[PDB]
Coordinates of C-alpha atoms in Angstrom, one line a residue:
Chain A
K5 CA 135.1 170.5 128.0
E6 CA 136.8 172.6 130.4
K7 CA 134.9 175.6 129.8
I8 CA 131.9 173.4 129.2
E9 CA 132.0 172.3 132.3
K10 CA 132.4 175.6 134.3
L11 CA 129.8 177.6 132.0
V12 CA 127.0 175.0 134.1
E13 CA 127.6 177.0 137.2
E14 CA 126.9 180.3 135.9
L15 CA 123.2 179.2 134.8
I16 CA 122.8 176.8 138.2
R17 CA 123.7 179.3 140.4
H18 CA 121.2 181.7 138.9
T19 CA 118.4 179.5 139.1
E20 CA 119.4 178.3 142.5
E21 CA 119.4 182.2 143.6
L22 CA 116.1 182.5 141.6
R23 CA 114.2 179.7 143.1
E24 CA 115.3 181.8 146.5
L25 CA 113.5 185.3 144.8
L26 CA 109.9 183.9 143.8
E27 CA 110.5 181.2 147.0
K28 CA 110.1 184.5 149.3
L29 CA 107.7 186.9 147.5
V30 CA 105.1 183.6 147.0
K31 CA 104.9 183.1 151.2
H32 CA 104.3 187.1 151.3
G33 CA 100.3 187.9 150.5
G34 CA 102.0 188.5 146.9
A35 CA 103.0 186.3 144.0
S36 CA 100.5 183.4 143.7
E37 CA 100.5 179.7 143.5
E38 CA 101.2 179.4 139.7
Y39 CA 104.2 181.1 139.1
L40 CA 105.8 179.0 141.6
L41 CA 104.7 176.1 139.2
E42 CA 106.8 177.6 135.6
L43 CA 109.8 178.4 138.4
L44 CA 109.5 173.9 139.2
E45 CA 109.0 173.9 135.5
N46 CA 111.8 175.9 135.0
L47 CA 113.8 173.4 137.2
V48 CA 112.6 170.4 135.8
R49 CA 114.5 172.4 132.2
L50 CA 118.0 172.3 134.2
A51 CA 118.1 169.4 135.1
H52 CA 117.4 167.8 132.2
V53 CA 120.0 169.9 130.3
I54 CA 122.1 169.1 132.3
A55 CA 121.6 165.5 131.8
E56 CA 122.0 166.0 128.0
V57 CA 125.5 167.7 128.4
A58 CA 126.8 165.4 131.4
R59 CA 125.9 162.7 128.5
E60 CA 129.2 163.7 126.4
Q61 CA 131.6 165.2 129.6
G62 CA 129.9 162.0 131.5
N63 CA 130.6 163.7 134.4
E64 CA 128.8 162.4 137.4
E65 CA 129.1 165.4 139.6
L66 CA 126.4 167.3 136.9
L67 CA 123.9 163.7 136.4
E68 CA 123.6 163.0 140.1
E69 CA 123.0 167.1 140.2
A70 CA 120.4 167.1 137.9
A71 CA 118.4 164.4 139.1
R72 CA 118.8 165.5 142.5
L73 CA 117.6 169.3 141.2
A74 CA 115.0 166.8 139.6
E75 CA 113.5 164.8 142.5
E76 CA 113.1 167.7 144.2
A77 CA 111.0 169.3 141.8
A78 CA 109.3 166.8 140.8
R79 CA 108.8 166.6 144.8
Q80 CA 107.5 169.7 145.7
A81 CA 105.4 169.6 142.5
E82 CA 103.3 166.7 144.2
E83 CA 102.9 168.4 147.1
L84 CA 101.7 171.4 145.7
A85 CA 98.8 170.0 142.8
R86 CA 97.5 168.4 147.0
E87 CA 97.2 171.8 148.2
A88 CA 95.5 172.7 145.2
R89 CA 93.6 170.0 144.6
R90 CA 91.6 170.5 148.4
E91 CA 91.0 174.2 146.7
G92 CA 89.5 173.4 143.7
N93 CA 91.6 175.7 141.3
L94 CA 92.0 172.4 138.7
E95 CA 93.6 174.6 136.4
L96 CA 96.7 174.6 139.2
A97 CA 96.4 171.6 139.6
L98 CA 96.8 169.7 136.3
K99 CA 99.5 172.2 135.1
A100 CA 101.3 170.5 138.6
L101 CA 100.5 166.9 137.5
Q102 CA 102.4 167.8 133.3
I103 CA 105.4 168.9 135.9
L104 CA 105.2 166.2 137.9
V105 CA 105.4 163.7 134.5
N106 CA 107.9 166.3 132.8
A107 CA 110.1 164.9 136.0
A108 CA 109.6 161.9 135.3
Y109 CA 110.7 161.4 132.4
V110 CA 114.3 163.7 133.1
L111 CA 114.4 161.1 135.9
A112 CA 114.1 158.1 133.1
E113 CA 116.4 159.6 131.0
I114 CA 119.0 159.5 133.2
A115 CA 118.6 156.4 135.0
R116 CA 118.6 154.6 131.9
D117 CA 121.3 156.5 130.0
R118 CA 123.9 156.1 132.8
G119 CA 122.4 152.5 133.8
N120 CA 122.1 152.5 137.3
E121 CA 118.6 150.8 138.5
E122 CA 118.8 152.8 142.1
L123 CA 116.1 155.1 140.7
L124 CA 114.2 153.6 137.4
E125 CA 112.1 152.5 139.4
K126 CA 111.6 155.8 141.3
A127 CA 110.7 157.5 138.4
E128 CA 107.9 154.9 138.0
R129 CA 106.9 155.9 141.2
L130 CA 106.5 159.2 140.9
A131 CA 104.8 158.7 137.1
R132 CA 102.4 155.9 138.7
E133 CA 101.1 158.4 141.1
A134 CA 100.1 160.6 137.9
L135 CA 98.3 158.6 136.4
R136 CA 96.4 158.0 139.1
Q137 CA 95.6 161.2 140.4
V138 CA 95.1 162.5 136.6
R139 CA 92.8 159.9 136.6
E140 CA 90.6 160.8 138.9
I141 CA 90.6 164.1 138.1
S142 CA 89.4 163.3 135.0
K143 CA 86.3 161.4 136.0
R144 CA 85.5 164.4 138.1
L145 CA 86.0 167.0 135.1
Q146 CA 84.1 164.0 132.6
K147 CA 81.6 164.6 136.2
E148 CA 81.7 168.4 136.1
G149 CA 81.0 169.1 132.3
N150 CA 83.1 171.3 132.2
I151 CA 85.1 170.9 129.1
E152 CA 87.8 173.3 128.9
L153 CA 89.6 171.9 131.9
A154 CA 88.5 168.4 130.7
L155 CA 89.9 168.7 127.2
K156 CA 93.5 168.8 129.2
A157 CA 93.4 167.0 131.6
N158 CA 92.9 164.4 128.1
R159 CA 96.1 165.6 127.5
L160 CA 97.9 164.5 130.4
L161 CA 96.2 161.3 130.6
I162 CA 98.5 160.3 126.9
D163 CA 101.2 162.4 127.5
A164 CA 101.5 160.6 130.8
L165 CA 101.4 157.0 128.8
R166 CA 104.2 158.8 126.9
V167 CA 106.5 158.2 130.0
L168 CA 105.3 154.7 130.4
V169 CA 106.9 153.4 127.1
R170 CA 109.9 155.1 127.6
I171 CA 110.8 153.8 131.0
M172 CA 110.8 150.3 129.1
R173 CA 112.1 151.0 126.3
Chain B
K25 CA 97.6 148.7 130.0
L26 CA 96.2 151.3 130.1
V27 CA 96.1 152.3 126.4
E28 CA 92.6 150.0 126.7
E29 CA 90.9 152.6 128.5
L30 CA 92.6 155.7 127.2
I31 CA 91.9 154.8 123.4
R32 CA 88.1 153.9 124.8
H33 CA 87.6 156.6 127.2
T34 CA 89.2 159.1 124.9
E35 CA 87.1 158.7 122.2
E36 CA 84.0 158.6 124.8
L37 CA 84.9 161.9 124.9
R38 CA 85.1 162.3 121.3
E39 CA 81.3 161.6 121.2
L40 CA 80.0 163.7 123.9
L41 CA 82.2 166.4 122.0
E42 CA 80.7 165.6 118.9
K43 CA 76.8 166.2 119.3
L44 CA 77.7 169.3 121.3
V45 CA 79.4 170.4 118.3
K46 CA 76.9 170.0 115.8
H47 CA 74.2 170.8 117.4
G48 CA 74.6 174.5 119.7
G49 CA 76.2 173.6 122.9
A50 CA 80.2 173.4 121.6
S51 CA 81.8 175.9 119.6
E52 CA 83.7 175.0 116.9
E53 CA 87.3 175.4 118.3
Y54 CA 86.9 173.1 121.3
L55 CA 85.7 170.3 119.1
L56 CA 89.7 171.3 117.5
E57 CA 91.5 170.8 120.5
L58 CA 90.1 167.9 121.4
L59 CA 91.3 165.9 117.6
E60 CA 94.8 167.0 118.4
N61 CA 94.7 165.2 121.7
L62 CA 93.3 162.3 119.1
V63 CA 96.6 162.6 116.6
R64 CA 99.0 162.8 119.9
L65 CA 97.5 159.2 121.1
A66 CA 97.8 158.1 117.7
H67 CA 101.9 158.3 118.2
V68 CA 102.1 157.5 121.4
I69 CA 100.4 154.3 120.5
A70 CA 102.6 153.7 117.6
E71 CA 105.7 153.5 119.2
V72 CA 104.6 151.4 122.6
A73 CA 103.5 149.3 118.6
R74 CA 107.1 149.0 118.1
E75 CA 108.6 148.0 121.5
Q76 CA 105.5 146.1 122.6
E77 CA 100.6 145.0 114.7
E78 CA 96.8 145.3 116.4
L79 CA 97.9 148.5 118.2
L80 CA 99.7 149.7 114.9
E81 CA 96.4 149.0 113.0
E82 CA 94.1 150.9 115.7
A83 CA 96.8 153.9 115.8
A84 CA 96.2 154.1 112.2
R85 CA 92.6 153.7 112.6
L86 CA 92.5 156.5 115.1
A87 CA 94.7 159.0 113.7
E88 CA 92.9 158.7 110.5
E89 CA 89.8 158.9 111.4
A90 CA 90.9 162.9 113.2
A91 CA 92.8 163.2 109.9
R92 CA 89.8 162.8 108.0
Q93 CA 87.0 165.2 110.5
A94 CA 89.7 167.8 110.2
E95 CA 89.4 167.7 105.9
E96 CA 85.9 168.6 106.3
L97 CA 85.6 171.1 109.0
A98 CA 88.3 173.3 107.8
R99 CA 86.2 173.1 104.1
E100 CA 83.7 174.8 106.6
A101 CA 85.2 177.5 107.6
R102 CA 87.4 178.4 104.7
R103 CA 83.7 178.7 103.5
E104 CA 82.1 180.6 106.0
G105 CA 84.8 182.8 106.3
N106 CA 86.1 182.1 109.7
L107 CA 89.3 181.7 108.3
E108 CA 91.4 181.3 111.6
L109 CA 89.6 178.6 112.6
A110 CA 90.3 176.8 108.9
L111 CA 93.2 177.5 109.3
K112 CA 94.1 175.6 112.9
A113 CA 91.9 172.3 111.6
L114 CA 94.1 172.1 108.4
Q115 CA 97.4 172.4 110.2
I116 CA 95.7 169.3 112.4
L117 CA 95.7 166.6 108.8
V118 CA 99.2 168.3 108.5
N119 CA 100.2 166.9 112.5
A120 CA 98.2 163.4 111.8
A121 CA 100.4 162.9 108.3
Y122 CA 103.2 162.5 110.4
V123 CA 101.3 159.9 112.9
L124 CA 100.5 158.1 109.6
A125 CA 103.5 157.8 107.8
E126 CA 105.6 157.0 110.5
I127 CA 103.2 154.3 111.4
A128 CA 103.1 153.4 107.7
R129 CA 107.2 153.3 106.8
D130 CA 107.3 151.0 110.1
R131 CA 104.8 148.7 108.8
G132 CA 105.5 148.1 105.8
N133 CA 101.8 149.9 103.9
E134 CA 103.5 151.5 101.1
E135 CA 99.5 152.4 100.3
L136 CA 99.2 154.0 103.5
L137 CA 102.3 155.9 102.9
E138 CA 101.0 156.9 99.5
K139 CA 97.9 158.4 101.1
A140 CA 99.9 160.0 104.2
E141 CA 101.6 161.9 101.4
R142 CA 98.3 162.9 99.6
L143 CA 96.8 164.9 103.0
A144 CA 100.0 167.2 103.4
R145 CA 100.0 167.7 99.7
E146 CA 96.4 168.8 99.8
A147 CA 97.1 170.2 102.7
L148 CA 99.8 172.3 102.0
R149 CA 98.2 173.2 98.7
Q150 CA 94.8 174.4 101.0
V151 CA 97.0 176.8 103.0
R152 CA 98.8 177.6 100.2
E153 CA 95.3 178.8 98.8
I154 CA 94.5 180.3 102.1
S155 CA 98.0 181.2 102.6
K156 CA 97.5 183.7 99.5
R157 CA 93.8 184.8 100.3
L158 CA 95.2 186.4 103.8
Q159 CA 98.0 188.3 101.9
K160 CA 95.2 189.9 99.6
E161 CA 92.9 190.9 103.0
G162 CA 95.2 192.5 104.8
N163 CA 95.3 190.9 107.3
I164 CA 98.8 190.0 108.7
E165 CA 98.7 188.4 111.7
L166 CA 96.9 185.3 110.5
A167 CA 99.2 185.4 107.2
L168 CA 102.3 185.4 108.5
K169 CA 101.3 182.3 111.6
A170 CA 99.3 180.9 108.6
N171 CA 102.7 180.9 106.4
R172 CA 103.9 178.8 109.7
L173 CA 101.6 176.5 108.3
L174 CA 103.3 175.9 105.5
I175 CA 106.6 175.6 106.4
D176 CA 105.9 173.0 108.9
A177 CA 103.9 171.0 106.4
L178 CA 106.6 171.1 104.1
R179 CA 108.8 169.5 107.0
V180 CA 106.0 166.4 106.8
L181 CA 106.8 165.8 103.0
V182 CA 110.9 165.7 103.2
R183 CA 109.7 163.2 106.3
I184 CA 107.9 161.2 103.8
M185 CA 110.1 161.5 100.7
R186 CA 113.8 160.7 102.1
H187 CA 112.7 157.7 103.8
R188 CA 110.8 156.5 100.1
Chain C
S3 CA 113.3 162.0 90.2
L4 CA 112.8 161.9 93.9
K5 CA 113.9 166.0 95.0
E6 CA 113.3 167.0 91.3
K7 CA 110.3 167.7 92.8
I8 CA 110.5 168.5 96.0
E9 CA 113.4 171.3 95.3
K10 CA 110.2 172.8 93.5
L11 CA 107.8 173.6 96.5
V12 CA 111.0 174.4 98.7
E13 CA 111.6 176.9 96.1
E14 CA 108.2 178.7 96.7
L15 CA 108.3 178.7 100.3
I16 CA 111.2 180.8 99.9
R17 CA 110.3 183.3 97.4
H18 CA 106.8 183.8 99.1
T19 CA 108.9 184.2 102.4
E20 CA 110.6 186.5 100.9
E21 CA 107.4 187.8 99.9
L22 CA 106.0 188.2 103.2
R23 CA 109.4 189.6 104.0
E24 CA 108.9 192.5 102.6
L25 CA 105.9 193.5 103.2
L26 CA 106.1 193.3 107.3
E27 CA 108.9 195.3 107.1
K28 CA 106.6 198.2 105.2
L29 CA 104.4 198.4 107.5
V30 CA 107.3 199.8 110.1
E31 CA 106.3 195.9 116.2
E32 CA 106.4 192.3 117.2
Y33 CA 104.9 190.8 114.7
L34 CA 108.4 191.2 112.7
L35 CA 109.3 189.5 115.8
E36 CA 107.0 186.7 114.8
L37 CA 108.4 186.8 111.3
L38 CA 112.0 185.5 112.3
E39 CA 110.6 183.1 114.0
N40 CA 108.6 181.7 110.9
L41 CA 111.7 182.7 109.0
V42 CA 114.2 180.7 110.8
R43 CA 111.9 177.7 111.1
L44 CA 112.2 177.8 107.1
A45 CA 116.2 177.9 107.1
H46 CA 116.3 175.0 110.0
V47 CA 113.7 173.0 107.3
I48 CA 116.0 174.0 104.1
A49 CA 119.0 173.1 105.4
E50 CA 117.4 169.1 106.4
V51 CA 116.8 169.0 102.8
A52 CA 119.8 170.1 101.3
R53 CA 121.6 167.6 103.6
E54 CA 119.4 164.7 102.3
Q55 CA 119.6 165.5 98.3
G56 CA 123.2 167.0 99.0
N57 CA 122.5 170.4 96.9
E58 CA 125.1 172.7 97.7
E59 CA 123.1 175.5 96.7
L60 CA 119.9 174.8 99.0
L61 CA 123.0 175.6 101.5
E62 CA 123.6 179.2 100.1
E63 CA 120.0 179.6 100.2
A64 CA 119.3 178.0 103.9
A65 CA 122.6 179.8 105.1
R66 CA 121.2 183.1 103.8
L67 CA 117.9 183.3 105.1
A68 CA 119.6 181.9 108.8
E69 CA 122.0 184.9 108.7
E70 CA 120.3 187.6 107.9
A71 CA 118.0 186.7 110.8
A72 CA 120.3 186.8 113.5
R73 CA 121.6 190.2 112.3
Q74 CA 117.8 191.4 112.2
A75 CA 117.4 189.6 115.8
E76 CA 120.3 191.5 116.9
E77 CA 120.4 194.9 116.8
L78 CA 116.4 194.8 117.4
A79 CA 117.6 193.0 121.0
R80 CA 119.7 197.0 121.6
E81 CA 116.7 197.8 120.6
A82 CA 114.9 196.8 122.9
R83 CA 116.2 197.1 125.5
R84 CA 116.6 200.7 125.5
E85 CA 113.1 201.1 124.9
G86 CA 112.1 199.6 128.0
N87 CA 109.9 197.2 126.2
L88 CA 112.1 194.1 128.1
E89 CA 109.2 191.6 126.6
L90 CA 110.3 192.6 123.0
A91 CA 113.9 192.6 123.9
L92 CA 113.8 188.7 125.3
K93 CA 111.8 187.1 122.2
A94 CA 114.2 188.6 119.7
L95 CA 117.3 186.8 121.8
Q96 CA 115.1 183.9 121.7
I97 CA 114.6 184.1 118.1
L98 CA 118.3 185.0 117.9
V99 CA 119.7 181.7 120.2
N100 CA 117.3 179.9 118.6
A101 CA 119.1 181.0 114.8
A102 CA 123.1 179.8 115.8
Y103 CA 121.7 176.2 116.1
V104 CA 120.6 176.2 112.7
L105 CA 124.3 177.5 112.3
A106 CA 125.8 174.5 113.4
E107 CA 123.5 172.1 112.1
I108 CA 124.9 173.7 108.8
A109 CA 128.5 174.1 109.3
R110 CA 129.2 171.0 111.0
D111 CA 127.2 169.2 107.8
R112 CA 128.6 171.4 105.4
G113 CA 132.4 171.5 107.2
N114 CA 133.1 175.4 107.5
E115 CA 135.1 176.8 110.3
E116 CA 134.4 180.4 109.4
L117 CA 130.5 179.7 110.1
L118 CA 131.0 177.3 112.5
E119 CA 133.4 180.4 115.0
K120 CA 130.8 182.7 114.4
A121 CA 127.8 180.9 116.0
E122 CA 129.9 180.1 119.2
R123 CA 129.5 184.2 119.5
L124 CA 126.3 184.8 119.0
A125 CA 125.3 182.0 121.4
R126 CA 127.1 182.9 123.9
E127 CA 127.0 187.3 123.5
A128 CA 123.0 186.5 123.9
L129 CA 123.4 184.3 126.6
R130 CA 124.8 187.0 128.5
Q131 CA 122.5 189.5 127.2
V132 CA 119.7 186.9 128.3
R133 CA 122.0 187.0 131.8
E134 CA 123.0 190.6 132.1
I135 CA 118.6 191.4 131.5
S136 CA 117.3 188.6 134.1
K137 CA 119.4 190.2 137.1
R138 CA 117.9 194.0 135.7
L139 CA 115.2 192.2 135.9
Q140 CA 115.9 190.3 138.9
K141 CA 116.3 194.4 140.5
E142 CA 112.9 195.8 139.1
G143 CA 110.4 193.3 141.4
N144 CA 109.3 191.9 138.2
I145 CA 109.3 188.6 138.6
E146 CA 107.3 186.9 135.9
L147 CA 109.5 187.7 133.0
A148 CA 112.2 187.1 135.3
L149 CA 110.8 183.6 134.7
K150 CA 111.2 183.7 130.9
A151 CA 114.3 185.5 130.7
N152 CA 116.0 182.5 133.3
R153 CA 114.5 180.3 130.5
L154 CA 116.2 181.2 127.6
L155 CA 119.5 181.1 130.0
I156 CA 119.2 177.7 131.0
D157 CA 117.7 177.2 126.9
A158 CA 120.6 179.4 125.9
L159 CA 123.7 176.7 128.2
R160 CA 122.1 174.0 126.4
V161 CA 122.8 175.5 122.8
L162 CA 126.1 176.9 123.8
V163 CA 127.3 173.0 124.6
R164 CA 126.4 171.6 121.9
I165 CA 128.1 173.7 119.6
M166 CA 131.6 173.3 121.0

């Protein structure tokens, strides 16, 4: 478990630097918003990976670090959805909520596994906003009659329901 | 909770899309993508019916309705020559079999396990028959992707065979 | 004879995939990689079938399919890294990294510390190769592939932790 705890540094160190290369190149007139979203999806995936390694080793210095990254990634995701919702890019908004819903499960998968109920409600708080937000977006997509984006909105409403069941069981 | 609103509302998206595919309004693939969402909802309901039978029966009625629509639509695309849509539609039946098995095998309905097992074998046979044609027609891109379906279809039989 | 009719269906898949292996190796580029991704999935499926029926010969066939994919994948990764085709190189390591999990899922259930020792080398070497391309891609002003290279390094670290 010595090198296994050490091997986590290479990914976390490279990712924290890789987040900056995309966080500074996206403020200039160059990079689009959607490329940063995939990085957020990459961040929550690392948070989930750190959670799966921390269960075997039981290192609380890594479960909390996965949650710190997960909460920071989910919080940034909600803002990007809010920013895109006024501009009319519905594909980007639904891509952001999918990131938020998945990030809630990582927070749940951690509180229930660790036992700390301090954040077990906070996963629901993120997930509750997504189900309400996508439902409002689904009706607008249903009203506009744009089926390609509307069909994708249904996938989020279904995938959000899977998270709600997992936080109770 | 919310599952009542979604099952009705998602079925409502099925009704608007079932008439636009019949009339000229909808390309078949857009109707196909909804089926993938339909089978996905049934599995979510199945995990809810365990942790929380009236929902298990609703998931099987809803899931089976997606599998039946897939086999019939697959036959139409198989006869028309559009093989890519036929292989994509046939996958929906394979995907629907796991939802039906996990819902029959965990509900004791032994007869429903016979219908779940039957669909994947026929789908695997149809996809195997579709796989052979793609090798002869020289279409390599669709043939290997069709092979991935036959491999992933075989996985369904093992999950329904080991648990028997 | 439960696993008797299943072992017949699995024989067809190993033969049909090996038959498709000759057609895709004879035309020669990325489509050959797609065969590896489709092939390694069969190795994991056959391994889960051999653990269920206890057939050791199916383990030998499952390891044969898995092991040849890692050798075929690593060579293209070295070739694709030098040709500038970095997207093709990243796909080869992704196929290479995923194939290592099949060896672990096999070795521990088969009990072979020689094959289990070699798997760790494959995932660790690939992770550094994915890391080395990530650093080189970071120097190139292309962020998009760096995102995909970064995702592999995350999944490469995930596989290495379980194989230990």
